[PDB]
């Protein structure tokens, strides 16, 4: 049975309490549709009731204690998630949490503490002398205590932070004694500094300490895996031991997915390798693929889509996925994939053989940003799509990618998996028509488009080939009938 992810939330979902229970109650129609794990969004309290869940305020209240004045997260309290996460693994569905450890933003108060401004085009560059600054690093929970842990934060836990209180400036410091950590991207020289309070990872306490709750979040949600966030400011030998440590505690295989945010394969390669392969990333360059091919209007070359993204060399270390809460409209790295391409590209993640693929909450039910061109819902084109990979997609492959608008592959079909197979074609211009061999053990066969895009249907020859149709701008997926 084929694998299927899910992101289950978009940046612009309301603040309303009922996230947890609207993922309970949607446990049944996800199964149906063949999703087999989902990825929820930060559970833990952040700087305020309405933090998305990347400010991560304390990681050891999931919307239990009233703290940062409220006792929900924005999603609920931890035992509506508890629920959810109940009626979930009740449906053979997999639950995956997302895990910010590269920061700590709304501190409870602040400390003094000295420091130098860095270059922030090349933070190895100091370029000041000393200076006394006011940095909001003390954290010591007051609404939960010690409850589940002791561990208070203070400035020498982290690296440095980007606002002194006391002037009222937004610089980046690095706190005295500290140093950026190692491995982490190059870019601007380092980029362990990203924003709020950077943990340290040079500091043996911390480094326990962040292994230490790793253990306890899934166990006390009993999670089944991770996805890692903002992997390129943190140091990449860590993140390597903590998925070591955490496996190796719960004695689960914790399938886990790292979000390193480039463009540029080869900076991927290089985690993937520092990291010892211990783990997925998500495939940002076939995302950026898909937006060129979606806004270029039939003039991108097709054929491209083979080459230069994580799926083409690492086949079983990748997570493709269309667009996600980062590229959703109105965020920082916009670059939504246009409605009439979106059918196609995911085709191309749900129907292939290769990477491990991720359907996004707000291309099923829409975005709620602002913008007059948010994401419509589109669950009804995605729907067969879904059931063509839970149904069809099985066998041997064959890639045909010969034309510059009509690329297409097939699915043998899988003895295993009553009447499998399929023959998928995607254009970004005009329609036209490919013969394609689907395998000799399925001549004979009326195959019809499951997408309903095309009415007639193909009958597969005696030597195993078919010849399929595909219109203008549009996708087909023949299964048999
Ligand atoms: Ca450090
Ligand atoms: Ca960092
Ligand atoms: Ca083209
Ligand atoms: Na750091």
């Known amino acids: 049975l084929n694998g299927t992810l899910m992101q289950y939330f978009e940046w612009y979902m309301p603040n309303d309490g009922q996230h947890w229970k609207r993922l309970q109650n949607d446990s049944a129609y996800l199964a149906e549709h ?10 833990y309290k952040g700087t305020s009731q309405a933090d998305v869940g990347y400010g991560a305020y304390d990681l050891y209240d999931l919307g239990e204690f009233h703290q940062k004045g409220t006792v929900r997260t924005k999603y609920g309290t931890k035992g509506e998630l508890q629920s959810a996460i109940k009626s979930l693994h009740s449906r053979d569905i997999n639950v995956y949490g997302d895990v910010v450890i590269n920061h700590k933003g709304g501190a409870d108060a602040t400390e003094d503490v000295t420091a130098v401004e860095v270059d922030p085009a090349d933070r190895n560059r100091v370029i000041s002398g000393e200076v006394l600054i006011k940095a909001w690093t003390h954290f010591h929970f007051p609404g939960r205590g010690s409850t589940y842990s002791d561990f208070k934060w203070h400035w020498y836990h982290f690296d440095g932070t980007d606002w002194d209180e006391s002037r009222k400036l937004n610089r980046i410091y690095k706190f005295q004694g500290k140093a950026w950590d190692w491995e982490v991207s190059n870019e ?5 500094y990203l924003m709020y309070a950077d943990i340290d990872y040079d500091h043996p306490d911390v480094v326990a300490e962040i292994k230490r709750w790793g253990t306890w979040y899934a166990n006390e949600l009993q999670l089944d895996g991770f996805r890692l966030d903002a992997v390129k400011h943190i140091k990449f030998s860590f993140l390597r031991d903590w998925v070591n440590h955490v496996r190796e505690k719960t004695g689960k295989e914790m399938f886990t997915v790292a979000e390193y945010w480039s463009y540029d394969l080869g900076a991927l390669e290089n985690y993937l390798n520092k990291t010892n392969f211990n783990h997925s990333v998500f495939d940002v360059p076939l995302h950026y693929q898909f937006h060129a091919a979606s806004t270029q209007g039939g003039g991108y070359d097709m054929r491209k889509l083979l080459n230069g993204t994580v799926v083409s060399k690492h086949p079983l270390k990748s997570v493709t996925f269309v667009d996600n809460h980062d590229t959703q409209p109105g965020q920082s790295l916009e670059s939504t994939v246009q409605t009439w391409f979106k059918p196609l590209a995911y085709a191309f993640i749900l129907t292939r053989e290769s990477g491990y693929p991720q359907v996004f909450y707000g ?8 913008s007059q061109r948010e994401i419509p819902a589109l669950k009804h084109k995605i729907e067969p799509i879904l059931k063509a990979r839970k149904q069809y997609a099985y066998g041997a492959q064959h890639d045909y990618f010969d034309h510059h608008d009509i690329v297409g592959w097939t699915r043998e079909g899988d003895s295993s998996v009553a009447n499998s197979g399929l023959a998928a074609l995607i254009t970004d211009g005009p329609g036209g028509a490919k013969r394609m061999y689907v395998g000799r053990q399925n001549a004979g066969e009326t195959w019809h488009d499951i997408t309903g895009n095309r009415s007639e249907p193909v009958v597969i020859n005696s030597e195993g080939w078919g010849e399929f149709h595909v219109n203008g701008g549009s996708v087909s997926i023949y299964v048999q009938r």
Not at 34 to 43: L, M, Y
Request: net charge negative.
């Open 34 to 43: 063949g999703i087999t794990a989902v990825w929820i969004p930060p559970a």
């Open 188 to 192: 601007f020289g380092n980029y362990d």
């Open 363 to 370: 291309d099923m039910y829409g975005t709620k940003g602002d």
